[PDB]
């Protein structure tokens, strides 16, 4: 069972309204645990998980200062790309970055990554070798050259293989009770009438952690690939997740359809039916 540390980083310009907004949001697995937001009354790195209480003010100071340096570097980037793309000074633009690492259950690095976008399109990315870059257009080629000349990938690789892995192990230890838990889904089926003697049956799964889950509708020991609708698994506001999946069946035939729920927290998968 692997784990990941990811940061989602965004810088968004806003001509006429002051400095760009700048935000860093960090996750261990699917759980938000830290956040920095330049628009806050008092912009600083803040805990978003209770177990992060285990870090002393030194940590918060160090991270905040890094974040403030990152903010400055991204303001510079926004300006740089504006020029390279020969774009008006009047429009808003966005830079995005995802940065982080994944480790195995033994705490060993599996993969590291860092990928940039501009205005929502691939810009530059670190390759799997952690040594070389892939640029997506001609402006990114300039950045690629700068970073080759400055040895940026070796710097990044040292963070991804060193710092990133080490902090992730420590977060997993400190938040063990929260991060390593399993919450079993609780499920139920709803029924909605339709025109033309057909019914919607909707299977809900609630209150689960971690986020990975599978819901299926079966007819005759067979899985339904069509007329089946669903939503992406989503957070429920308390650090648990939910999902639903529906199928449209002939009225009067409801009892022949079953919903199946597979989850880390279910030694045996759930089987449910519409209960009139």
């Amino acid at each position: 069972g692997p784990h990941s540390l990811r940061y989602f980083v965004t810088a968004v310009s806003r001509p006429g309204l002051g400095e760009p907004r700048y935000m860093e949001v960090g996750y261990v697995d699917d759980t938000e645990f830290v956040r920095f937001d330049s628009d806050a009354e008092n912009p600083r790195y803040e805990p978003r998980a209770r177990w992060m209480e285990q870090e002393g003010p030194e940590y918060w100071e160090r991270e905040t200062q890094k974040a403030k340096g990152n903010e400055q570097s991204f303001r510079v980037d926004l300006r740089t790309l504006l020029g390279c793309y020969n774009q008006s000074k009047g429009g808003s633009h966005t830079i995005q970055v995802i940065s982080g690492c994944e480790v195995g259950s033994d705490g060993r690095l599996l993969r590291g990554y860092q990928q940039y976008a501009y205005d929502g399109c691939d810009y530059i990315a670190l390759n799997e070798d952690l040594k070389t870059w892939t640029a997506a257009d001609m402006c990114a080629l300039i950045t690629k050259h700068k970073w080759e000349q400055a040895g940026e990938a070796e710097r990044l690789r040292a963070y991804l293989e060193g710092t990133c892995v080490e902090w992730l192990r420590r977060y997993l230890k400190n938040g063990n009770a929260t991060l390593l838990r399993t919450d079993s889904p609780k499920a139920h089926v709803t029924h909605h009438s339709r025109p033309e003697d057909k019914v919607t049956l909707r299977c809900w799964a609630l209150g689960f952690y971690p986020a990975d889950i599978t819901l299926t509708w079966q007819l005759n020991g067979e899985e339904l690939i069509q007329d089946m609708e669903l939503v992406e698994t989503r957070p429920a506001g308390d650090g648990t997740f939910q999902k639903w999946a529906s199928v449209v069946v002939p009225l009067g035939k409801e009892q022949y359809y079953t919903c199946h729920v597979y989850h880390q927290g279910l030694p045996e998968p759930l089987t449910l039916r519409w209960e009139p």
Binding site: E63, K66, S73, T80, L81, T143, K146, W147, E152
Partner: peptide
């Protein structure tokens, strides 16, 4: 802990 990013 977050990376200290380089300028582009």
């Amino acid at each position: 802990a977050v990376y200290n990013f380089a300028t582009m």
